[PDB]
């Protein structure tokens, strides 16, 4: 009644990446980088950079 | 008309809805890998010198 893993923003692979990565600058950079959506605007903004 | 800069700061953002950006900042935002792409034709056709 509290947490539907399918219908959720932060699914289980991001939890695995959180639990497995070493705490570093580059891991913070990665976890910001994986918050990008699969939207066509995200594809456009990723093509431009 | 008057030498009061404070109201000049106030009377511009007075719940300002439309925020139009200039072409120059939109030029220098994007890098060179997409500036020559034909999607950026309007920014390219006024960069002639």
């Amino acid at each position: 009644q509290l947490f539907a893993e399918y219908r959720e923003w932060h699914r289980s692979p991001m939890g695995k990446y959180a639990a497995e990565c070493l705490p570093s600058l580059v891991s913070i950079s990665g976890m910001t980088a994986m918050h990008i959506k699969m939207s066509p605007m995200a594809y456009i903004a990723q093509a431009k950079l | 008309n008057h030498m009061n800069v404070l109201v000049i700061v106030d009377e511009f953002y007075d719940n300002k809805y439309a925020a139009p950006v200039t072409d120059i900042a939109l030029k220098c935002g994007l890098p060179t890998e997409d500036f020559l792409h034909p999607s950026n034709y309007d920014l390219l056709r006024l960069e002639l010198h």
């Binding site: 066509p40 605007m41 456009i44 | 034909p38 999607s39």
Partner: peptide, 20 residues
């Protein structure tokens, strides 16, 4: 319609055409 138009504007709206 506006997001569809922005998408169609920021991409392209023998040559050997290639799929992906």
């Amino acid at each position: 319609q506006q997001v569809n138009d922005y998408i169609k504007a920021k991409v392209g709206a023998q040559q050997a055409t290639c799929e992906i």
